[PDB]
Amino acid sequence: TERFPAREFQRDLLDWFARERRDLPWRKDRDPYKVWVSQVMLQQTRVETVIPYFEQFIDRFPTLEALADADEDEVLKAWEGLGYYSRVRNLHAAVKEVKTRYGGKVPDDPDEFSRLKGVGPYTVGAVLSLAYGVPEPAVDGNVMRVLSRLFLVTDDIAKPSTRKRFEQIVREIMAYENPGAFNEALIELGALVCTPRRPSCLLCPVQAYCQAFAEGVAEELPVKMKKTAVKQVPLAVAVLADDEGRVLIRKRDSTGLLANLWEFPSCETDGADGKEKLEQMVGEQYGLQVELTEPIVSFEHAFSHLVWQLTVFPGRLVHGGPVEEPYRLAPEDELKAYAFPVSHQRVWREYKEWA
DNA sequence: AAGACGTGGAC
DNA sequence: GTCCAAGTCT
Ligand code: SF4
Ligand SMILES: [Ca+2]
Ligand SMILES: [Ca+2]
C-alpha cells in the first residue's frame, strides 16, 4: 500500500465514524472486562441480537471477579438463547485464569491475552485496542468485506494467505493515534454502509479510495465459498407429565452439542419408530413406566452443521421412586429456571398450545 | 486442517 | 429462503 493515501483515508473514515457511531451499551466506557464480554457475545451474533443480552449479563455479573465467583449453571442460563454456548464456558474459564494468574487485570500484551480461552485473532485485536490502545488489527467479517473492496482482493477470504494480507493492510493504514477508534470504524463501515448486498457506495465516506467502486465489481466481493448442504437428523421428543403435574427433563452431558443444557428426553429415529424408541428409552431408567400418545407437531431446527427434524410425542409417566440422574422432575413453574436450547423451548411452547 | 459448534437480523 | 454476523475450538 505504497500509493495509498493512508492519512487522507483515516481522516474521512474517522470523521464519518464520529457522526454515525451507534449508541451501544458497551461503548459507554472502556472497561476491559465489559469490552471483552461484548466482543465474545458479538462473535457470529448480530449487534441488535446482543444488546439485551449484554445489558442483562452485566447486571448479573458486573465485574470480572463476579463472573469468576459465579456458578457455571447461572453463567449458562445468562447465555440461554444466544447460541454457540462454549463461548461462555471459555469466557468463564478465562476470567478465572485472569483472577488467578493476573490479579484480576486483563493482560495488555497480545500473546498473553490471546492465550486465554475464547480469545482468537479477532478478539485480541478488538479488546486490546479499545481498552488499552494496543495497535492490533481486529479483522472480522465486516472488515474482510470492506478491505477486499477497497483493495480489490479476489482471493477466498478463508485462506490464511488472505488473512495475513488483510492483517498487513490494517497495520499499514491504521491510525496509530487511536487504534481502538480506527478498528471500530472499519467494522461500523461494513455494518452500516459497505454491506454484503447492495452496498451504499454513494453515501460512502471513503468512496474515493475504493478500488472495487472504480472497477464496478463491489457486489462480487468478498469471495466466500458457498455453503454445502447439511445433514438432516430425525429426532423424537417426549413431553411427559405425571398426576402431580411435574415434567420429566434431563441434562445433556458436558461434551459436544448444546452441552450442559436441559432438554426433554429425545432420541434418534431413522424412520418412524419414534413412539417405540422413546418408550424403550424412558423405561430403561429405574422404576419409570411410560405410555405415549400420537405426535402433535413436527418442526425443523437449524444448526450451522446439521438440521434437527423434531417430532413431539406427549405422554404420561409413573415413577415408583426417585428419578435417577441425569433425569429430573420439575413442576411447570420451575421450568423457566432451567436453561433450554431454543429447539426445546419451542417443543415446550408447542405442547402448551396443544393442551 | 477439517469440521464441530446456535441463532436470528436483515433483506 | 438465503446469507452471514463485529469467530473459535484444537
Ligand atoms: S465505495 Fe462501496 S464498496 Fe467501496 S468501501 Fe464504500 S460502500 Fe464499500
Ligand atoms: Ca488465542
Ligand atoms: Ca457428549
GROMACS .gro file of C-alpha atoms (C1' of nucleotides) and ligand atoms in nm:
model
  386
    1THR     CA    1   0.000   0.000   0.000
    2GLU     CA    2   0.275   0.242  -0.108
    3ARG     CA    3   0.048   0.455  -0.331
    4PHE     CA    4  -0.235   0.457  -0.071
    5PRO     CA    5  -0.315   0.795   0.099
    6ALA     CA    6  -0.342   0.643   0.446
    7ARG     CA    7  -0.372   0.977   0.624
    8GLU     CA    8  -0.641   1.109   0.389
    9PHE     CA    9  -0.828   0.776   0.429
   10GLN     CA   10  -0.812   0.786   0.812
   11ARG     CA   11  -0.941   1.145   0.824
   12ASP     CA   12  -1.250   1.075   0.616
   13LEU     CA   13  -1.318   0.742   0.792
   14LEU     CA   14  -1.279   0.873   1.144
   15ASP     CA   15  -1.481   1.189   1.066
   16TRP     CA   16  -1.767   0.972   0.938
   17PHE     CA   17  -1.747   0.742   1.239
   18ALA     CA   18  -1.791   1.023   1.491
   19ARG     CA   19  -2.111   1.134   1.320
   20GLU     CA   20  -2.273   0.793   1.261
   21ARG     CA   21  -2.140   0.585   1.554
   22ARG     CA   22  -2.426   0.381   1.703
   23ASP     CA   23  -2.513   0.416   2.073
   24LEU     CA   24  -2.441   0.073   2.210
   25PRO     CA   25  -2.429  -0.031   2.576
   26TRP     CA   26  -2.062  -0.148   2.555
   27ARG     CA   27  -1.949   0.186   2.408
   28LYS     CA   28  -2.031   0.381   2.723
   29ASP     CA   29  -1.674   0.331   2.859
   30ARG     CA   30  -1.353   0.129   2.809
   31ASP     CA   31  -1.365  -0.119   3.099
   32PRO     CA   32  -1.152  -0.410   2.968
   33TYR     CA   33  -1.392  -0.667   3.118
   34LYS     CA   34  -1.705  -0.513   2.961
   35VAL     CA   35  -1.537  -0.477   2.623
   36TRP     CA   36  -1.425  -0.841   2.641
   37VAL     CA   37  -1.776  -0.958   2.724
   38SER     CA   38  -1.930  -0.764   2.436
   39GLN     CA   39  -1.678  -0.894   2.184
   40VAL     CA   40  -1.734  -1.254   2.286
   41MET     CA   41  -2.112  -1.209   2.266
   42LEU     CA   42  -2.066  -1.048   1.923
   43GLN     CA   43  -1.885  -1.345   1.772
   44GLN     CA   44  -2.109  -1.463   1.488
   45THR     CA   45  -2.404  -1.279   1.657
   46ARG     CA   46  -2.552  -0.952   1.528
   47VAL     CA   47  -2.536  -0.632   1.728
   48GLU     CA   48  -2.914  -0.599   1.757
   49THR     CA   49  -2.938  -0.952   1.897
   50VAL     CA   50  -2.657  -0.896   2.150
   51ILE     CA   51  -2.785  -0.569   2.303
   52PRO     CA   52  -3.039  -0.705   2.556
   53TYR     CA   53  -2.816  -1.000   2.636
   54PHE     CA   54  -2.520  -0.774   2.724
   55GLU     CA   55  -2.742  -0.548   2.936
   56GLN     CA   56  -2.870  -0.840   3.146
   57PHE     CA   57  -2.536  -1.024   3.164
   58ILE     CA   58  -2.355  -0.724   3.306
   59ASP     CA   59  -2.641  -0.669   3.552
   60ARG     CA   60  -2.594  -1.019   3.693
   61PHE     CA   61  -2.215  -1.019   3.653
   62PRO     CA   62  -2.085  -0.661   3.677
   63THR     CA   63  -1.715  -0.737   3.725
   64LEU     CA   64  -1.454  -0.988   3.610
   65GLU     CA   65  -1.443  -1.111   3.971
   66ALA     CA   66  -1.822  -1.152   3.990
   67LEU     CA   67  -1.822  -1.372   3.680
   68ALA     CA   68  -1.533  -1.583   3.817
   69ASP     CA   69  -1.701  -1.644   4.156
   70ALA     CA   70  -2.031  -1.745   3.993
   71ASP     CA   71  -2.163  -2.096   3.935
   72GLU     CA   72  -2.146  -2.235   3.584
   73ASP     CA   73  -2.519  -2.307   3.574
   74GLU     CA   74  -2.604  -1.940   3.637
   75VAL     CA   75  -2.349  -1.842   3.373
   76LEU     CA   76  -2.506  -2.074   3.119
   77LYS     CA   77  -2.858  -1.952   3.192
   78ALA     CA   78  -2.750  -1.589   3.123
   79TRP     CA   79  -2.637  -1.700   2.773
   80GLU     CA   80  -2.953  -1.908   2.709
   81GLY     CA   81  -3.070  -1.845   2.354
   82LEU     CA   82  -2.757  -1.673   2.219
   83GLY     CA   83  -2.606  -1.982   2.058
   84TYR     CA   84  -2.251  -2.114   2.039
   85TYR     CA   85  -2.254  -2.186   2.413
   86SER     CA   86  -1.888  -2.290   2.455
   87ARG     CA   87  -1.807  -1.916   2.412
   88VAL     CA   88  -1.936  -1.864   2.765
   89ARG     CA   89  -1.770  -2.172   2.910
   90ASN     CA   90  -1.448  -2.041   2.757
   91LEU     CA   91  -1.514  -1.688   2.880
   92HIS     CA   92  -1.583  -1.823   3.231
   93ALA     CA   93  -1.262  -2.025   3.249
   94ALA     CA   94  -1.072  -1.731   3.104
   95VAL     CA   95  -1.185  -1.488   3.372
   96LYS     CA   96  -1.082  -1.738   3.640
   97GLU     CA   97  -0.739  -1.757   3.476
   98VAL     CA   98  -0.724  -1.376   3.484
   99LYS     CA   99  -0.822  -1.359   3.853
  100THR     CA  100  -0.552  -1.613   3.941
  101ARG     CA  101  -0.252  -1.561   3.715
  102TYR     CA  102  -0.308  -1.188   3.651
  103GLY     CA  103  -0.457  -1.039   3.969
  104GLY     CA  104  -0.787  -0.964   3.801
  105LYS     CA  105  -0.616  -0.740   3.543
  106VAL     CA  106  -0.692  -0.824   3.179
  107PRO     CA  107  -0.348  -0.866   3.012
  108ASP     CA  108  -0.241  -0.588   2.778
  109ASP     CA  109   0.015  -0.794   2.591
  110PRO     CA  110  -0.144  -0.973   2.292
  111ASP     CA  111   0.044  -1.302   2.339
  112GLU     CA  112  -0.071  -1.336   2.696
  113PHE     CA  113  -0.426  -1.220   2.623
  114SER     CA  114  -0.468  -1.444   2.316
  115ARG     CA  115  -0.359  -1.738   2.533
  116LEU     CA  116  -0.687  -1.716   2.724
  117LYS     CA  117  -0.966  -1.949   2.613
  118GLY     CA  118  -1.217  -1.798   2.371
  119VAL     CA  119  -0.977  -1.524   2.252
  120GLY     CA  120  -0.878  -1.556   1.890
  121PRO     CA  121  -0.718  -1.314   1.643
  122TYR     CA  122  -1.033  -1.102   1.619
  123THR     CA  123  -1.094  -1.072   1.993
  124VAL     CA  124  -0.729  -0.995   2.080
  125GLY     CA  125  -0.741  -0.702   1.839
  126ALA     CA  126  -1.083  -0.576   1.949
  127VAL     CA  127  -1.032  -0.584   2.325
  128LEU     CA  128  -0.675  -0.466   2.341
  129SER     CA  129  -0.719  -0.175   2.100
  130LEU     CA  130  -1.031  -0.047   2.274
  131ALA     CA  131  -0.928  -0.097   2.636
  132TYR     CA  132  -0.551  -0.020   2.615
  133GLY     CA  133  -0.488   0.136   2.271
  134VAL     CA  134  -0.278  -0.155   2.150
  135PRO     CA  135  -0.240  -0.128   1.766
  136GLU     CA  136  -0.355  -0.486   1.694
  137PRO     CA  137  -0.587  -0.547   1.396
  138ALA     CA  138  -0.944  -0.668   1.460
  139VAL     CA  139  -1.032  -0.836   1.132
  140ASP     CA  140  -1.395  -0.968   1.137
  141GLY     CA  141  -1.644  -1.043   0.857
  142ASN     CA  142  -1.726  -0.675   0.818
  143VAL     CA  143  -1.357  -0.574   0.785
  144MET     CA  144  -1.275  -0.851   0.541
  145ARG     CA  145  -1.559  -0.735   0.316
  146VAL     CA  146  -1.462  -0.365   0.329
  147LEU     CA  147  -1.092  -0.437   0.272
  148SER     CA  148  -1.149  -0.679  -0.011
  149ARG     CA  149  -1.344  -0.399  -0.187
  150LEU     CA  150  -1.113  -0.106  -0.104
  151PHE     CA  151  -0.813  -0.307  -0.221
  152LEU     CA  152  -0.969  -0.545  -0.478
  153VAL     CA  153  -0.872  -0.872  -0.308
  154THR     CA  154  -1.006  -1.154  -0.527
  155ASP     CA  155  -0.894  -1.450  -0.314
  156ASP     CA  156  -1.114  -1.655  -0.084
  157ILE     CA  157  -1.115  -1.472   0.246
  158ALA     CA  158  -1.095  -1.807   0.429
  159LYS     CA  159  -0.738  -1.877   0.314
  160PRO     CA  160  -0.452  -1.790   0.556
  161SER     CA  161  -0.268  -1.618   0.274
  162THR     CA  162  -0.568  -1.384   0.251
  163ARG     CA  163  -0.595  -1.331   0.627
  164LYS     CA  164  -0.230  -1.247   0.661
  165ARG     CA  165  -0.283  -0.998   0.379
  166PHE     CA  166  -0.576  -0.828   0.550
  167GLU     CA  167  -0.373  -0.801   0.870
  168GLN     CA  168  -0.084  -0.647   0.678
  169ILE     CA  169  -0.317  -0.394   0.518
  170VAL     CA  170  -0.453  -0.285   0.857
  171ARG     CA  171  -0.104  -0.241   1.003
  172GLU     CA  172  -0.009  -0.018   0.708
  173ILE     CA  173  -0.323   0.207   0.710
  174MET     CA  174  -0.424   0.211   1.072
  175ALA     CA  175  -0.419   0.535   1.272
  176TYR     CA  176  -0.174   0.455   1.547
  177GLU     CA  177  -0.300   0.771   1.725
  178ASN     CA  178  -0.629   0.595   1.811
  179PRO     CA  179  -0.623   0.226   1.719
  180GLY     CA  180  -0.946   0.148   1.900
  181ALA     CA  181  -1.147   0.405   1.707
  182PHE     CA  182  -0.984   0.303   1.378
  183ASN     CA  183  -1.075  -0.064   1.433
  184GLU     CA  184  -1.431   0.010   1.537
  185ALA     CA  185  -1.474   0.246   1.241
  186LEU     CA  186  -1.384  -0.010   0.972
  187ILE     CA  187  -1.633  -0.250   1.132
  188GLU     CA  188  -1.903   0.014   1.152
  189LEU     CA  189  -1.849   0.093   0.788
  190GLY     CA  190  -1.909  -0.268   0.694
  191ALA     CA  191  -2.219  -0.283   0.916
  192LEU     CA  192  -2.392   0.042   0.802
  193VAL     CA  193  -2.265   0.126   0.453
  194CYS     CA  194  -2.042  -0.136   0.286
  195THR     CA  195  -2.298  -0.414   0.336
  196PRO     CA  196  -2.298  -0.769   0.193
  197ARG     CA  197  -2.569  -0.692  -0.067
  198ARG     CA  198  -2.628  -0.359  -0.243
  199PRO     CA  199  -2.357  -0.153  -0.067
  200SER     CA  200  -2.435   0.220  -0.025
  201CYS     CA  201  -2.129   0.344  -0.218
  202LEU     CA  202  -2.295   0.682  -0.283
  203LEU     CA  203  -2.328   0.752   0.091
  204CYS     CA  204  -1.978   0.610   0.146
  205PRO     CA  205  -1.723   0.838   0.315
  206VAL     CA  206  -1.426   0.656   0.157
  207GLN     CA  207  -1.563   0.613  -0.195
  208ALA     CA  208  -1.265   0.800  -0.343
  209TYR     CA  209  -1.020   0.537  -0.212
  210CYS     CA  210  -1.220   0.228  -0.315
  211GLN     CA  211  -1.089   0.015  -0.600
  212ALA     CA  212  -1.400  -0.202  -0.640
  213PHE     CA  213  -1.622   0.104  -0.682
  214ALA     CA  214  -1.387   0.235  -0.954
  215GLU     CA  215  -1.385  -0.102  -1.137
  216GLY     CA  216  -1.757  -0.168  -1.069
  217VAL     CA  217  -1.709  -0.508  -0.905
  218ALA     CA  218  -1.812  -0.438  -0.546
  219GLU     CA  219  -2.112  -0.670  -0.519
  220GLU     CA  220  -1.892  -0.960  -0.640
  221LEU     CA  221  -1.667  -0.922  -0.332
  222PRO     CA  222  -1.566  -1.060  -0.095
  223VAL     CA  223  -1.500  -1.409  -0.223
  224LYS     CA  224  -1.650  -1.672   0.010
  225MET     CA  225  -1.731  -2.033  -0.059
  226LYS     CA  226  -2.097  -2.126  -0.093
  227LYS     CA  227  -2.228  -2.337   0.196
  228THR     CA  228  -2.269  -2.713   0.137
  229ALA     CA  229  -2.587  -2.893   0.240
  230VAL     CA  230  -2.601  -3.017   0.598
  231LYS     CA  231  -2.720  -3.347   0.742
  232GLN     CA  232  -3.085  -3.380   0.842
  233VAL     CA  233  -3.134  -3.565   1.170
  234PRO     CA  234  -3.477  -3.701   1.269
  235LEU     CA  235  -3.546  -3.665   1.641
  236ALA     CA  236  -3.837  -3.785   1.857
  237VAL     CA  237  -3.904  -3.578   2.172
  238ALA     CA  238  -4.129  -3.684   2.461
  239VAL     CA  239  -4.308  -3.432   2.687
  240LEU     CA  240  -4.406  -3.647   2.988
  241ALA     CA  241  -4.606  -3.523   3.291
  242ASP     CA  242  -4.744  -3.704   3.597
  243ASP     CA  243  -5.057  -3.693   3.816
  244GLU     CA  244  -4.890  -3.428   4.033
  245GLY     CA  245  -4.813  -3.204   3.731
  246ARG     CA  246  -4.434  -3.229   3.713
  247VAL     CA  247  -4.249  -3.273   3.381
  248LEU     CA  248  -3.959  -3.505   3.301
  249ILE     CA  249  -3.641  -3.332   3.176
  250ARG     CA  250  -3.277  -3.428   3.165
  251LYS     CA  251  -2.941  -3.257   3.150
  252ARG     CA  252  -2.720  -3.304   2.846
  253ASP     CA  253  -2.358  -3.411   2.901
  254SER     CA  254  -2.070  -3.164   2.921
  255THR     CA  255  -1.917  -3.255   2.582
  256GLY     CA  256  -2.028  -3.159   2.234
  257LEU     CA  257  -2.358  -3.027   2.111
  258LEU     CA  258  -2.566  -2.799   2.334
  259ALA     CA  259  -2.353  -2.908   2.628
  260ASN     CA  260  -2.479  -2.890   2.987
  261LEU     CA  261  -2.821  -2.770   2.874
  262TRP     CA  262  -3.154  -2.921   2.976
  263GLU     CA  263  -3.392  -3.090   2.733
  264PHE     CA  264  -3.696  -3.301   2.710
  265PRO     CA  265  -3.599  -3.667   2.659
  266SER     CA  266  -3.527  -3.741   2.293
  267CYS     CA  267  -3.365  -3.996   2.063
  268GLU     CA  268  -3.264  -4.050   1.701
  269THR     CA  269  -3.525  -4.220   1.483
  270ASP     CA  270  -3.413  -4.311   1.134
  271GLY     CA  271  -3.758  -4.400   1.001
  272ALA     CA  272  -4.073  -4.351   1.209
  273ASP     CA  273  -4.044  -4.587   1.506
  274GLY     CA  274  -4.026  -4.294   1.747
  275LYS     CA  275  -4.316  -4.390   1.975
  276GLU     CA  276  -4.139  -4.724   2.021
  277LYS     CA  277  -3.784  -4.594   2.053
  278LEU     CA  278  -3.886  -4.338   2.317
  279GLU     CA  279  -4.075  -4.588   2.535
  280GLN     CA  280  -3.776  -4.823   2.524
  281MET     CA  281  -3.551  -4.533   2.630
  282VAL     CA  282  -3.758  -4.387   2.915
  283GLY     CA  283  -3.837  -4.731   3.062
  284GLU     CA  284  -3.466  -4.821   3.074
  285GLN     CA  285  -3.444  -4.578   3.370
  286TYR     CA  286  -3.509  -4.700   3.724
  287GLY     CA  287  -3.875  -4.754   3.816
  288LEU     CA  288  -4.008  -4.545   3.525
  289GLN     CA  289  -4.321  -4.653   3.337
  290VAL     CA  290  -4.445  -4.458   3.038
  291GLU     CA  291  -4.717  -4.455   2.772
  292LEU     CA  292  -4.719  -4.200   2.486
  293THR     CA  293  -4.993  -4.060   2.264
  294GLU     CA  294  -4.975  -3.975   1.893
  295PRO     CA  295  -4.748  -3.691   1.776
  296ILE     CA  296  -4.871  -3.332   1.787
  297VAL     CA  297  -4.618  -3.135   1.577
  298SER     CA  298  -4.304  -3.171   1.372
  299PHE     CA  299  -4.069  -2.882   1.306
  300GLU     CA  300  -3.711  -2.827   1.192
  301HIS     CA  301  -3.440  -2.657   1.396
  302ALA     CA  302  -3.124  -2.544   1.222
  303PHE     CA  303  -2.765  -2.550   1.341
  304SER     CA  304  -2.467  -2.444   1.133
  305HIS     CA  305  -2.355  -2.802   1.065
  306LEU     CA  306  -2.676  -3.009   1.086
  307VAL     CA  307  -3.054  -2.970   1.100
  308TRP     CA  308  -3.280  -3.139   1.354
  309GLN     CA  309  -3.624  -3.261   1.250
  310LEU     CA  310  -3.823  -3.270   1.572
  311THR     CA  311  -4.142  -3.464   1.634
  312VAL     CA  312  -4.308  -3.407   1.972
  313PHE     CA  313  -4.487  -3.701   2.142
  314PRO     CA  314  -4.692  -3.612   2.453
  315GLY     CA  315  -4.732  -3.875   2.721
  316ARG     CA  316  -4.771  -3.952   3.092
  317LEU     CA  317  -4.527  -4.102   3.343
  318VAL     CA  318  -4.545  -4.320   3.654
  319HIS     CA  319  -4.242  -4.333   3.884
  320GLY     CA  320  -4.205  -4.579   4.172
  321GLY     CA  321  -3.913  -4.398   4.324
  322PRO     CA  322  -3.657  -4.125   4.283
  323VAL     CA  323  -3.583  -4.035   3.922
  324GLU     CA  324  -3.218  -4.110   3.856
  325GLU     CA  325  -2.980  -3.853   3.724
  326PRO     CA  326  -2.939  -3.720   3.462
  327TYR     CA  327  -3.318  -3.701   3.474
  328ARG     CA  328  -3.526  -3.480   3.698
  329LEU     CA  329  -3.891  -3.394   3.750
  330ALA     CA  330  -3.980  -3.027   3.751
  331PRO     CA  331  -4.311  -2.851   3.813
  332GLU     CA  332  -4.415  -2.631   3.522
  333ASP     CA  333  -4.321  -2.326   3.730
  334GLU     CA  334  -3.961  -2.440   3.780
  335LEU     CA  335  -3.902  -2.486   3.405
  336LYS     CA  336  -3.833  -2.116   3.346
  337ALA     CA  337  -3.534  -2.154   3.581
  338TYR     CA  338  -3.354  -2.422   3.375
  339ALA     CA  339  -3.154  -2.340   3.062
  340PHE     CA  340  -3.306  -2.494   2.747
  341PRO     CA  341  -3.189  -2.471   2.386
  342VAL     CA  342  -3.418  -2.283   2.150
  343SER     CA  343  -3.534  -2.605   1.983
  344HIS     CA  344  -3.670  -2.734   2.315
  345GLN     CA  345  -3.817  -2.405   2.427
  346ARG     CA  346  -4.028  -2.444   2.114
  347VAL     CA  347  -4.103  -2.807   2.193
  348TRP     CA  348  -4.248  -2.676   2.518
  349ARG     CA  349  -4.444  -2.394   2.357
  350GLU     CA  350  -4.600  -2.636   2.109
  351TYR     CA  351  -4.704  -2.866   2.397
  352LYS     CA  352  -4.867  -2.588   2.596
  353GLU     CA  353  -5.056  -2.468   2.287
  354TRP     CA  354  -5.178  -2.820   2.206
  355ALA     CA  355  -5.329  -2.852   2.556
  356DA     C1'  356  -0.665  -2.884   0.883
  357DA     C1'  357  -1.132  -3.003   0.888
  358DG     C1'  358  -1.528  -2.993   1.076
  359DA     C1'  359  -1.797  -2.902   1.514
  360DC     C1'  360  -2.034  -2.557   1.716
  361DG     C1'  361  -2.651  -2.193   1.766
  362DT     C1'  362  -2.943  -1.849   1.641
  363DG     C1'  363  -3.179  -1.493   1.412
  364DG     C1'  364  -3.128  -0.999   1.190
  365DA     C1'  365  -3.191  -0.818   0.753
  366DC     C1'  366  -3.322  -0.839   0.342
  367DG     C1'  367  -3.546  -1.870   0.162
  368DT     C1'  368  -3.078  -1.720   0.183
  369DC     C1'  369  -2.684  -1.517   0.363
  370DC     C1'  370  -2.384  -1.437   0.723
  371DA     C1'  371  -2.292  -1.186   1.164
  372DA     C1'  372  -1.837  -0.715   1.480
  373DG     C1'  373  -1.543  -1.636   1.519
  374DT     C1'  374  -1.308  -2.005   1.796
  375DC     C1'  375  -1.209  -2.468   1.921
  376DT     C1'  376  -0.759  -2.768   1.868
  377SF4     S1  377  -1.744   0.271  -0.202
  377SF4    FE1  378  -1.893   0.097  -0.179
  377SF4     S2  379  -1.768  -0.088  -0.196
  377SF4    FE2  380  -1.622   0.086  -0.159
  377SF4     S3  381  -1.591   0.089   0.064
  377SF4    FE3  382  -1.758   0.233   0.020
  377SF4     S4  383  -1.955   0.111   0.037
  377SF4    FE4  384  -1.778  -0.035   0.025
  378CA      CA  385  -0.573  -1.732   2.114
  379CA      CA  386  -2.134  -3.593   2.455
   0.00000   0.00000   0.00000
